[PDB]
Amino acid sequence: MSICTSEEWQGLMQFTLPVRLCKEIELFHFDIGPFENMWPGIFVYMVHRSCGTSCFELEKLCRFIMSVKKNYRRVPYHNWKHAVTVAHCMYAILQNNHTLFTDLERKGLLIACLCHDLDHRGFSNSYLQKFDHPLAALYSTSTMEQHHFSQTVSILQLEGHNIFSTLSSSEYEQVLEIIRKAIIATDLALYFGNRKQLEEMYQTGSLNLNNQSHRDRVIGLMMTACDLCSVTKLWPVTKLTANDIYAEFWAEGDEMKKLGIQPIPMMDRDKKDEVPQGQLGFYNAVAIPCYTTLTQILPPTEPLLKACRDNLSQWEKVIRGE
Template identity: 45%
Template sequence: FDLDDDDTCRAAVRMFLQCNLVQQFHIPYDVLCRWILSVRKNYRPVKYHNWRHALNVAQTMFAMMKTGKMERFMTDLEILGLLVACLCHDLDHRGTNNAFQSKTDSPLAILYTTSTMEHHHFDQCVMILNSEGNNIFQALSPDDFRKVMKVVESAILSTDLAMYFKKRNQFLELVEGGEFDWQSEEKKEVLCGMMMTACDVSAIAKPWEVQHRVAKLVADEFFDQGDLEKLQLNQQPVAMMDRERKDELPKMQVGFIDVICLPLYKVLSDAFPWIRPLYEGTMDNRQHWQDLAEKVEMGLTWIDHDTIDKPVEEFACEIEALADIEFTVTTLNCAHPEDKTDTTPVHERKPRFSSLRKTGALGKAVRNKLSKSVYSSQTAIGSTTAGAPSSG
């Protein structure tokens, strides 16, 4: 909360430097800085799923690698891919979840029928890398490039909690079976997926002062979606997105911790003891939330409702714009659409990029085209940099 925007970018650069990734993979310093700034600029100013959330997720991954000693199980190339995935895992998030995309038949839901937003986040990541001056993988061999992109894609898609539930039992079986060899491709992918989820929800393990503030931001964003569902779909939102049930947030936080966070952190800390602070921090915060939940049951108010009571005013007049796809990528050489001052009343603005609407084949076609484009540039580079170091 105390870092300004420039400081957050410096922190991101520092993580790459301290992991020795800049030196190991010959990433030009100006390209790394430009890429980080471009990634930051392609996060929307939503309340929670924004650039600062991405940075916090990356910082937790960095801490897991260093303090948690997980780097001993990873190649340098995998560490590079995981840090990139963390910073990019919510690119262009609109403040609404996959269920909302499906309910509204949004163009993104038509493009990607499963893990809708996660596929979009990955595609945005690819397009930034494919932008001029932003390819931090430019010195990789073609083989290393394929490997790191596979890590990035798998890691970003694993942040869909639906994917987490599918793979959690598999991970539990490996740990309970005494698995200590994580080098096979299949096991490594499962481990990386669990680590991504652990980082994605890691605000739950932060000191209480931080966790309390983050929880209000998450609730604000969820309640905004609930307001949209009432306005646009005439539906009653689920409890965690219903502003009228805001006093139940402590109880819902306890449920979230018990169902998702504690089981994950417990099995991770059992297998990798250096990660135990995540489990202990979550246990501490669970007690805080439980105490607040008990206050609510006694009829006491637990939270300052000044911000959480107020729906987002522009929702009523931006419903049409929600259906638009923005497959544009903002780099340092162009302005972000939301940075431009538009004096036209919001309700009179025309949808952008309407030519990209509702074409079921577009998602796969776009991804294939972009991947081939980036890969072709890597092949050309590889032919002249055969001696480029490989992480193995």
């Protein structure tokens, strides 16, 4: 696939985060947006503050991050910026609930977050399946998500990027499986089922964090909550992020129009007027339920739901002309 230069990872090793960001990075609403140059360095900081300064060989970690950066395409939304936004939200989740998770879970989850959309071409699973893309022949279900995990393993299996080699054989297999489940849970189709099972478990009082299956379900919803966190930022950031998401949807719809196929309104560039209504529906059907369930299981996660509710109110104000 694609490897980083020696210049790149060496510069990353030298990086020190400014003290004003130290405070701000702990906050859920933190926008990485204005600090592009610092993004690989922000990740290292997060790994170190969550797992410790010596739980990963600095050299190997820097080569990994830099190769991960390289294997993210320059698509409008599913890019390197998205990888770091998702990893930051996970960092904020882990920090506010530190001892609920194991050291192996904290490790794998931050890496799974940075790799979850690895080598995204800007096309949905529906597209790949309907136009019989080689990737759909390889992976029948959760097409992109199984490919993103394949890329993650392939970056690990690269010369001096294998950040986990120093773990036990038992521990290496576990973390690689935590990562597999985490990246697969990021397939939004799987979320709806998972969210309903967790909601029942919470209501009946049967949710037990010591139960592996229950644990894997909670991690899954954390993955979805991190993947959607752009809906959790200040209204001007959230509004701009939706422009990138729709730029990608419209580009996919344009490829269907070129084949004579009419795209769904969401992927139609001619149907922009329907976007505020589409966002309201997504917040009501997907985002609000996700953050609601996450707050019930993990009460410290509450500011995510609070900001989501604020952005929903903003979309209502766009619909009602305010």
